[PDB]
């Protein structure tokens, strides 16, 4: 028989059609996604110790530690460490989903842009993005999202957009700084920039 | 091309190749310490990687990943061979290295914010178009 350890469910005699229909099912697919999300979370946050093999300190060692001093230990409260470890986990997650995409913004008018940066017209993954879309069987989600799709064709020439600068662009966005170190910045800029 | 103002995307490529391929993890510190001094547009991101990657240090010997042994003892007064209770000594060490990173960030932030505010805010077109195009 066939049993899906992700879904924890038996089914009747597996035929390649029935099994292949199950493996692309929606309920199955969210449960499988959850499974590997949890296992990757575990192999990150497994907090377990190496064994500590403690050696008897020599006397010649133990004099020089008597000189130095005790050094103070900082320890947070329970509620404090609850908040701060939430914050630190949130910082690692948003620093992991951060990607640098400036060079796609800078080349936005160039003559061969659609063929290299649209990524649907590329010659290596152009067919694959076409195959990747979905069966798209529920079109009610497509009619619920009432945007225009606004695809870039491959057939663009440089005649369109002759003068890029005629109000069409906006300035480059300023470089982001660390919010914990935001008082580090010089207080006043050098020149008087209006607006 | 490594000193380009927008060259952060190159250094992301180099760091993800290092972090997948290399087993030793000294090469990641040695590349990221160089990246820390370049006045890139996205300079903060690599400061945040260095701060997280300092914050996850779990004992004293890992600090020889950061710099050398003699520079730690002479400049910052950290002994890696300190045998004793090593908890608060490590917290003191991480506080000292986070301070020396703060001063290096402060230098690079001045560089980057100066270059952006005078010059790079003003350039809009970064690519060749055609022999018939005009520039403002």
């Amino acid at each position: 028989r066939y049993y899906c350890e992700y879904c924890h469910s038996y089914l009747t005699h597996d035929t390649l059609s029935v099994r292949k229909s199950h493996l692309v099912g929606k309920n199955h697919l969210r449960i499988t996604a959850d499974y590997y999300r949890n296992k990757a979370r575990d192999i990150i946050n497994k907090h377990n110790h190496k064994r500590r093999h403690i050696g008897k300190r020599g006397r010649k060692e133990r004099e020089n530690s008597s000189q130095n001093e005790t050094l103070k230990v900082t320890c947070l409260s329970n509620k404090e460490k609850r908040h701060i470890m939430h914050v630190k986990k949130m910082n690692q997650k948003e620093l992991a989903q951060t990607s640098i995409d400036t060079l796609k913004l800078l080349y936005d008018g160039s003559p061969g842009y659609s063929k290299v940066f649209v990524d649907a017209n590329r010659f290596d993954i152009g067919d694959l993005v076409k195959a990747s879309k979905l069966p798209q069987r529920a079109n009610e989600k497509s009619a619920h999202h009432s945007f225009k799709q606004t695809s870039r064709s491959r057939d663009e020439t440089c005649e369109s957009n002759p003068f890029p600068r005629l109000n069409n662009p906006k300035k480059l966005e300023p470089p982001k700084i660390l919010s914990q170190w935001s008082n580090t910045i010089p207080k006043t800029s050098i020149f008087y920039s209006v607006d | 091309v490594g000193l380009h103002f927008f060259s952060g995307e190159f250094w992301d490529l180099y760091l993800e190749q290092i972090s997948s391929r290399c087993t030793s993890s000294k090469k990641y510190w040695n590349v990221l310490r160089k990246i820390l001094e370049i006045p890139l547009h996205s300079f903060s991101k690599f400061y945040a990687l260095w701060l997280q990657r300092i914050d996850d240090i779990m004992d004293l010997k890992q600090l020889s990943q950061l710099t050398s042994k003699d520079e730690l003892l002479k400049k910052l007064k950290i002994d890696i061979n300190y045998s004793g209770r090593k908890g608060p000594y490590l917290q003191d060490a991480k506080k000292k290295l986070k301070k020396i990173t703060k001063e290096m960030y402060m230098v690079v932030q001045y560089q980057v914010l100066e270059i952006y505010s005078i010059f790079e805010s003003k350039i809009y077109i970064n690519y060749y178009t055609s022999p018939e195009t005009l520039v403002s």
């Binding site: 910082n91 948003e94 620093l95 951060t98 966005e173 300023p174 470089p175 982001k176 700084i177 660390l178 919010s179 914990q180 935001s182 910045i185 010089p186 207080k187 006043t188 800029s189 050098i190 020149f191 008087y192 920039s193 | 903060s44 991101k45 945040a48 914010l113």
Partner: peptide
């Protein structure tokens, strides 16, 4: 909130030295 924020700075009060447009 997020660990990356845009920088913000004070204006330098517009004399003839801090005017970027000054040509004389």
């Amino acid at each position: 909130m997020s660990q990356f924020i845009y920088p913000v700075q004070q204006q330098p009060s517009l004399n003839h030295f801090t005017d970027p447009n000054n040509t004389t």
